[PDB]
Design a protein around this ligand. Sequence first.
Ligand SMILES: NC(=O)c1ccc[n+]([C@@H]2O[C@H](COP(=O)([O-])OP(=O)(O)OC[C@H]3O[C@@H](n4cnc5c(N)ncnc54)[C@H](O)[C@@H]3O)[C@@H](O)[C@H]2O)c1
Ligand SMILES: NC(=O)c1ccc[n+]([C@@H]2O[C@H](COP(=O)([O-])OP(=O)(O)OC[C@H]3O[C@@H](n4cnc5c(N)ncnc54)[C@H](O)[C@@H]3O)[C@@H](O)[C@H]2O)c1
Lengths: 330, 330
Amino acid sequence: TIKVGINGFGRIGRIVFRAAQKRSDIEIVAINDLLDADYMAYMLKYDSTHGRFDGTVEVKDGHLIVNGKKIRVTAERDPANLKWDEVGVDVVAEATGLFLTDETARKHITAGAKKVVMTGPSKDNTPMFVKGANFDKYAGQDIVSNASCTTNCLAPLAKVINDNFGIIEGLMTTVHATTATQKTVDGPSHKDWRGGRGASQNIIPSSTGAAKAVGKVLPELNGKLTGMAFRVPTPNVSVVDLTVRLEKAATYEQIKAAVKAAAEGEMKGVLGYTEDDVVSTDFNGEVCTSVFDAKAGIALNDNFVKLVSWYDNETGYSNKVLDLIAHISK
Amino acid sequence: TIKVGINGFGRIGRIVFRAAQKRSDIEIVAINDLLDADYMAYMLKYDSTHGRFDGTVEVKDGHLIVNGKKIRVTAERDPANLKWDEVGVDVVAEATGLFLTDETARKHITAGAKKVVMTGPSKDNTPMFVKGANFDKYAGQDIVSNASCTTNCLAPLAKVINDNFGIIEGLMTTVHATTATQKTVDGPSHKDWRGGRGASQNIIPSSTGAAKAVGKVLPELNGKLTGMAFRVPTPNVSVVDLTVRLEKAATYEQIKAAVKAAAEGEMKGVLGYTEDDVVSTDFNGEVCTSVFDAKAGIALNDNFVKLVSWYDNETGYSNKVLDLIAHISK
Ligand SMILES: NC(=O)c1ccc[n+]([C@@H]2O[C@H](COP(=O)([O-])OP(=O)(O)OC[C@H]3O[C@@H](n4cnc5c(N)ncnc54)[C@H](O)[C@@H]3O)[C@@H](O)[C@H]2O)c1
Ligand SMILES: NC(=O)c1ccc[n+]([C@@H]2O[C@H](COP(=O)([O-])OP(=O)(O)OC[C@H]3O[C@@H](n4cnc5c(N)ncnc54)[C@H](O)[C@@H]3O)[C@@H](O)[C@H]2O)c1
């Protein structure tokens, strides 16, 4: 199997670990953060969002013992000091959010790993890969990114709408749930003033280049999309609101048939389709990175439409990151 | 196999149905509320608090088919028009919060049912039974009550404490989750001015009879306890705060030992014991009606202490309701 090492036992680092348990190809051998193996264990055991860990976790000699398997624990602030090779790591999952450039994330390879997958969009030219978008373009690069959560939701959809009706232009808006970067009450966020204001108290307009990034994963769409976001008071799962102009006219019943078909075939396991009266909680724990909501979307006419799709920014993305690791190996 | 009908397909009505699916002695044969079989099916398929129904459900002829079995659907507002006997209903789970007196609840007997179990404390002399307190005092009555979610938490604990060191007097406080009786924004609640205030915006002081009621199911304690509640912005899982004076002096480590023993034996399944740094969400879906939080409790001296216990006001209570049903059914 593929020996995976995690750096940053955060929301993504933890959920990636949880979901990694229901996989036969990958296996977590080591974890790094800045905590004691007893706190790390408490963090894995209880989750306010996805409930109690489904298995056993014990602390022993400063390391974890999850499901009877020893997980090496470290608390090194610098990635270059991780000696991942002492534990046989193949690919490293960069979930800290501090190492999204090649020079930063490469410390993992010089530390003994083989490849690295950033759990966020790269900040330099490091290639981004999206399941159902361009996984087929991976060219053996040793450091890759899995784009963002919003992109993993918008790319698979735009792709289907473009392949059937051709997208002239599109403007996206994602209503996102709160994340670890926000504040409980109005506090400092000097890189983004709006993002520091009380999360649970407001609807916070926010920026995102997830729409622009779709043109980089699907070049055909390059430059045709852009958008923004609204951070709202929910602990998880968000939804994208894409308004596009189409080349080849089509009725909603027709747009519906297109998505459902992809959802049933090529985009199976990535793009989903539903006609139910769902709400955000119905997706807490969802593995499909994009679930089309037939009943929520709306069209002004056969060439101007607003489509809506759901994504559990935590589980969907975390599962795809693992897919990318399996993809780039061997 | 006990056949049961549910009156009021609400939060408790619905969780009871879900809990019953894992039991082989109980069988839900009919359901009544004030809605269509298709809305009923939606209410059951999707739950914001406990996830998507874990099984199959379909609508047919105007009734539902859940897990290969057919459930009769009615929308009768007057319980006496239910003809429970047409489907062979043994016991009915009164879950509307509207028929909590023998008079109103007896209509279910008039309608064909042989026994009734109100999911709320009786409004009259109707006998209340609480698992871990007075189940063994059931004397064949046809109409009983499972008390409240709060009394089902306090009674089991108050008994281990009484039996071990004797309780002279106690005052209780329950930090309770929001319920269907509350409102989204400041609205009319003619019978509880505070309860009508925006649930999500306030810490709402509320009165309880759960404390006194403990003396009714544990006569020894009669008159020695009383209390109040605080309604806070959470969707589920509450906790009781018991401050008591003890006859026999006991260290906190003595008290814990007693609880842990009753929990690991005599009260196993009703009262639980933990020493972890738990929070409310860690109990969403908990079956034990009272989980003692060792680490949260505080003692002023060997005769004056504050004890803490957690309870999923939805899942534990709904499970014990099925317990009482199984109990009175012999
Ligand atoms: N939150 C989401 O829903 C979501 C979805 C997709 C992608 N992402 C991306 O994934 C990354 C993970 O975000 P997250 O939500 O888990 O955040 P998080 O803050 O919950 O987790 C990050 C973890 O990094 C640890 N850490 C900090 N400095 C470290 C260091 N020097 N060495 C090792 N560990 C260190 C922190 O203690 C923390 O546990 C971010 O870059 C984010 O942009 C987040
Ligand atoms: N909410 C809790 O956590 C909790 C815990 C223990 C006990 N209880 C008790 O259980 C009862 C259930 O409360 P709940 O939270 O499920 O409330 P709820 O409002 O969610 O459920 C009540 C259901 O009754 C239906 N109903 C109304 N009038 C009816 C009629 N004439 N005939 C049939 N159905 C009718 C409503 O449409 C609704 O679905 C209450 O009496 C409450 O005191 C509630």
